[PDB]
Amino acid sequence: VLSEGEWQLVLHVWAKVEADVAGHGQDILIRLFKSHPETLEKFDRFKHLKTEAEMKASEDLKKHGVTVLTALGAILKKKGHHEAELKPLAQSHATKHKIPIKYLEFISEAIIHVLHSRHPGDFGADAQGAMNKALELFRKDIAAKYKELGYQG
Ligand code: HEM
Ligand SMILES: [O-]
Secondary structure (H helix, E strand, O other): OOOHHHHHHHHHHHHHHOOOHHHHHHHHHHHHHHHOHHHHHOOHHHHOOOOHHHHHHOHHHHHHHHHHHHHHHHHHOOOOOOHHHHHHHHHHHHHHHOOOHHHHHHHHHHHHHHHHHHOOOOOOHHHHHHHHHHHHHHHHHHHHHHHHHOOOO
8 A cells, every 4th residue: 555655765764673682582572572462472482471571681582583584575565565474474373373363453563663763863753653553463464364264353
């Protein structure tokens, strides 16, 4: 749906996030985990995790932010013609993971806070919205598939 220009904005921020992937993932992760305790409850490999200290301390977390950020970018860069990557994920998330669209949204949040937090100058409003647009988009499709599938309350 989103504009030539908007993709523009959405993309350059990416390239920046690409500078320190693991950092960001860790970031987003922690944000998410702190803000929506429910979300972490769902990762078996992480539940053990008690403090912010612990989190940033743990390497498997690290790796984890990585796994995610990667899939994420892959989609962005596709400027909406992201089907290739999304499908599998929607299935994965709906069928084993058990992740609520609410999470996608949740996560989505930490994402932009994180982005904001880490790029004061680079990310004013023009960027912020593009970014948000992009996200609901990811949100939209993954939602659809869910339906198809019988998920999505
Ligand atoms: C930004 C959106 C996200 C992306 C791109 C994403 C991507 C991925 C990828 C690529 C995998 C591993 C291969 C696979 O299972 O598909 C994965 C595994 C998983 N993800 Fe997601 N994820 C996202 C958000 C979330 C959220 C919000 C939760 C929890 C609410 C979550 C929980 C999990 C769990 C539990 C696993 C298996 C975790 C593990 O490997 O043990 N993901 N995710
Ligand atoms: O994830």
